[PDB]
Write a protein that binds this ligand. Structure first.
Ligand code: DAN
Ligand code: NAG
Ligand code: NAG
Ligand code: NAG
Ligand code: NAG
Ligand code: NAG
Length: 620
């Protein structure tokens, strides 16, 4: 966990007590084997932590009730209750998997309820022992002489089953549950719940169940995920709802929707497929928290997920990520060493960052309450860097084009390599994904390469487990200022996006040859000379790839062949990295490149001219 940060075993396995109330009223303090499925929120000043209180064993299909522990002193002190009771219909009756919403001084909890099944939910024969329960709680935060206090009265639970269609587009429905963890209140005031639906047969999938009348009605919105998507999380971004899904056996799928879920678009230019369940991505996946907060004047999203280096359900190394839907920063591990963590929750309150997440030892589970001093600190530092640079760049008077000129483009400006560097790392100005460097010597705002393999590699698939530049495969705009320093024996590489796989494939890219012509590479079509360039002279290159199409620009003008289809078929390309210069063959590209900019969209033509018109102004 960050140096400075700390934690406390808030819901301690086999130690902590919950007031279990017997059939006939008596209430007894009772030990609880494992506490799993945490969520901690902030109802009007009073901290609320909800969880599965699994009395006898950690297994899903045993006896479970929803416990809370709220507080009015930022964790100094804590009270404990049992928010929802199970039916008590057998020795496995349970309510679980709370998905929580907070509006005003009310808490709307949504849990799955089962009576006697001993197998898990997707494999049930019908939905007859399952019920979707809605429960509301109200925080009453009265005080007393320099000492606030508070109560939470919980209401009888209400079943949502009569409002669940038997059919979705002809998909027979079996059962549903909320996504797990915190959901939200829409900026339009709706109560929105991401929910996971199992059909008759075990296919699972995701949807938005919302309320525009504070709890009284619920509507199942038109759109859905792909099959294999479960435990969705949700937040609102620039008028849109963004739904991050858990995906067993594959990479995490992300969808955006602008109509409260009526239509879903897969977020291929931003967050989809970036995150995953294990280095090899074929393991069971794991719940995540995905929360919109404002830090240092700026709205970012916050995302938690373990690396699972150990695999299966160990869920070691919980991580924390922060993104503005453009850049993605890895804050670090919020958990200690090789401990096995699990489902987590993050909460920003009165300028303090916190977490409530699982720890697992021999499958007996605890919930730790963590204080993110370190992380927050680091988080502000980079939000400061994003604002700081966005604004700078957005404040450069670029030249007026014969019709101050249009702004330097910063929207979806993902990364940028300028002046800061050394012999083996060109650093990202937006502090997220640096460049790996070789045989280079510094020049203002960039590197002059010279030597076998001199160039730089901006990891794309080579990034590894988490793939933060996953976007390039859908669209990108790669920009750079260059000169050719020495003529090439034949043809050498200048700037590109090269393909994972055997051989030496490139998606789109540009090279120069012995004749002083440019050789743009458009997918697998063979390079063919075009134009003229003059050693030493400064050129503005921009490579552009969208709609499976590519274009290359020199001096704001597109070279011949631009627009050529660059990849065939439905699968997205798997870009390995972007190359600057000439990072098998002993490639010695003798060039100097400076100020490389990266965008998650296809900049436009006037946008490209803005950059061409202002490249001697963007540098750090
Ligand atoms: C209803 C239920 O089974 N809940 C469990 C869920 C589910 O089992 C699985 O995601 C696929 O059905 O999994 C997990 C889990 O740590 O993986 C915890 C949940 O409590
Ligand atoms: C519960 O754990 C606490 C934390 O250290 C400790 O004080 C105490 O020994 C434990 N009580 C039990 C049930 O043994
Ligand atoms: C309620 O149930 C418990 C369970 O053993 C019993 O001992 C308790 O005193 C009961 N209360 C009454 C008044 O029966
Ligand atoms: C489950 O059991 C309870 C307790 O008797 C019953 O009233 C409830 O309605 C049952 N319904 C389901 C979800 O099968
Ligand atoms: C080079 O600089 C980067 C950050 O600028 C740093 O991570 C690296 O360790 C430095 N030194 C080496 C060995 O390249
Ligand atoms: C180019 O895009 C910029 C910003 O996204 C915008 O100002 C301008 O209207 C666009 N021009 C075209 C060609 O649509």
């Amino acid at each position: 966990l960050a140096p400075g940060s700390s934690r406390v075993e808030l819901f301690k396995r086999k130690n902590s007590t919950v007031p279990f109330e017997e059939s006939n009223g008596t209430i007894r303090e009772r030990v609880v084997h494992s506490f799993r499925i945490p969520t901690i929120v902030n109802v009007d000043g009073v901290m609320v932590a909800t969880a599965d209180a699994r009395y006898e064993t950690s297994f899903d299909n045993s006896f479970i009730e929803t416990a809370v522990k709220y507080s009015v002193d930022d964790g100094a002190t804590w009270n404990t209750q049992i928010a929802i009771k199970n039916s008590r219909a057998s020795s496995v009756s349970r309510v679980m998997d709370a998905t929580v919403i907070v509006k005003g001084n009310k808490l709307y909890i949504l849990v799955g309820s089962f009576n006697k099944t001993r197998n898990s939910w997707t494999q049930h024969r019908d939905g007859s022992d399952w019920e979707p329960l809605l429960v509301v709680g109200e925080v009453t935060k009265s005080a007393a002489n320099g000492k606030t206090t508070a109560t939470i009265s919980w209401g009888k639970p209400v079943s949502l089953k009569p409002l669940f269609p038997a059919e979705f587009d002809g998909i027979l429905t079996k059962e549903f549950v909320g996504g797990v963890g915190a959901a939200i209140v829409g900026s339009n005031g709706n109560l929105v719940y991401p929910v996971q639906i199992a059909d008759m047969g075990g296919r699972v999938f995701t949807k938005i169940m919302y309320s525009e009348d504070d709890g009284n009605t619920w509507k199942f919105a038109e759109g859905r995920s792909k099959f294999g998507c479960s435990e969705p999380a949700v937040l609102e971004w620039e008028g849109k709802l963004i739904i991050n899904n858990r995906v067993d056996g594959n990479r995490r799928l992300v969808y955006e929707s602008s109509d409260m879920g009526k239509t879903w678009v897969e977020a291929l230019g931003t967050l989809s497929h970036v995150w995953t369940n294990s280095p090899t991505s074929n393991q069971q996946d794991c719940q995540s928290s995905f929360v919109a907060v404002t830090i240092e004047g700026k709205r970012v999203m916050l995302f938690t997920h373990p690396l699972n280096l150990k695999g299966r359900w160990m869920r070691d190394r919980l991580h924390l990520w922060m993104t503005d839907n453009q850049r993605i920063f890895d804050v670090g591990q919020i958990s200690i060493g090789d401990e096995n963590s699990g489902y987590s929750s993050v909460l920003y309150k009165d300028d303090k960052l916190y977490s409530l997440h699982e720890i697992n030892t021999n499958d007996v589970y605890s919930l730790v309450f963590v204080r993110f001093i370190g992380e927050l600190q680091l988080m502000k530092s980079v939000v400061r860097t994003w604002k700081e640079e966005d604004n700078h760049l957005a404040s450069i008077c670029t030249p007026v084009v014969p019709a101050c000129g249009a702004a330097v483009p910063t929207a979806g400006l993902v990364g940028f390599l300028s002046h800061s560097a050394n012999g083996s790392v060109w650093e990202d100005v937006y502090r997220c994904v640096d460049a790996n460097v070789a045989n280079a010597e510094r020049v203002p705002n960039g590197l002059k390469f010279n030597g076998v393999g001199g160039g730089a590699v901006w990891p794309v698939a080579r990034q590894g487990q988490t793939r933060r530049y996953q976007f390039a495969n859908y669209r990108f705009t790669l920009v750079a200022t260059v000169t050719i320093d020495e003529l090439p024996k034949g043809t050498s590489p200048l700037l590109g996006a090269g393909l994972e796989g055997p051989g030496d494939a490139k998606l789109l890219g540009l090279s120069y040859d012995k004749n002083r012509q440019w050789r743009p590479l458009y997918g697998a079509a063979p390079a063919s000379p075009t134009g003229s360039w003059e050693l030493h002279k400064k050129y503005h290159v921009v490579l552009t790839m969208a709609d499976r199409q590519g274009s290359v620009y020199v001096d704001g003008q597109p070279l011949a062949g631009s627009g050529n289809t660059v990849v065939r078929g439905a699968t997205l390309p798997d870009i390995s990295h972007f190359y600057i210069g000439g990072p098998g063959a002993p490639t010695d590209s003798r060039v100097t490149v400076t100020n490389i900019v990266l965008y998650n969209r296809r900049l436009n033509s006037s946008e490209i001219r803005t950059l061409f018109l202002s490249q001697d102004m963007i540098g750090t």
